[PDB]
Design a protein around this nucleic acid. Structure first.
Lengths: 84, 167
RNA sequence: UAUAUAUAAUAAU
């Protein structure tokens, strides 16, 4: 469970979904997984999407080059969770 | 130096720093603490960093049970990040018609050391639907009791289930 | 079916 590997996109309006995110993040190299959902039950999360990168390699260059930048109401966060 | 900072846990979604301190400085002396709960902005994770200058206050603080809002707080000395991630949590379904956390916590206490376990109650929020929670410092015990989904409890079996991770 | 955390995370069943 390293300190960087995935990116969490939370404060993001329906303006940019899996299509825009798929490149707002990838904007550096290859990615791996991309997921987008809202808060149908929680009733809180508006635009949440999980973007897993190739690994500390692409994540190093991506999260380091881009992780939290003027986007939406909050800046993308450096994720790390990994799924076997 | 080796010990002094703590990780207040189970904080009620309604606590302040000066308030949390005035409450804690009842044991010894404290130099600083970083509480997150912010009733003014709205709400935040319920935890609190207590920078106890005298490592002792930490020993009695974690070795003592207290109730700020009267809900349920869990004070523990700072815990290693890797140890926190290793800890696993399982959610228990179904429970006796009138079981108190005394047993439950003692119940699971046998196998798999219980780092943070307990039964929830409507008092905590109002969802006394009938459930339970258990936390071990490892996932090995989880998979261990896992094969034992339904377990014989007081009078009603308990359906064990992962805290959420279907795995 | 439900959970108050290491200052951050959607869905499901």
């Amino acid at each position: 469970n390293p300190p960087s590997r995935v990116v969490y996109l939370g404060s993001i309006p329906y303006d940019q979904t899996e299509e825009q995110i798929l490149d707002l993040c990838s904007n550096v190299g290859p990615v791996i997984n991309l997921k987008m959902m809202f808060d149908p039950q929680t009733g809180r999360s508006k635009g949440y999407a999980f973007i897993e990168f190739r690994d500390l390699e692409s994540s190093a260059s991506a999260v380091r080059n881009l992780n939290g930048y003027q986007l939406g109401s909050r800046f993308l966060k450096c994720g790390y969770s990994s799924n076997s | 130096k080796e010990s002094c900072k703590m990780f207040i846990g189970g904080l009620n979604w309604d606590t302040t720093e000066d308030n949390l301190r005035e409450y804690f400085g009842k044991y010894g002396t404290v130099t600083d603490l970083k509480i997150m709960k912010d009733p003014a902005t709205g709400r935040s994770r319920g935890f609190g960093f207590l920078s106890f200058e005298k490592p002792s206050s930490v020993d009695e603080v974690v070795k003592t049970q207290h109730i700020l809002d009267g809900k349920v707080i869990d004070p523990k000395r700072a815990i290693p990040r890797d140890e926190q991630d290793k800890t696993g949590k399982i959610f228990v379904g179904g429970i006796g018609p009138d079981v108190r956390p005394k047993e439950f916590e003692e119940f699971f206490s046998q196998w798999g050391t219980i780092i943070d376990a307990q039964l929830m109650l409507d008092k905590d929020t109002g969802q006394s639907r009938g459930f339970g929670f258990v936390t071990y410092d490892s996932a090995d015990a989880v998979d261990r009791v896992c094969q034992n989904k339904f377990i014989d409890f007081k009078d009603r079996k308990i359906e064990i289930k992962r805290a959420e991770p279907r795995h």
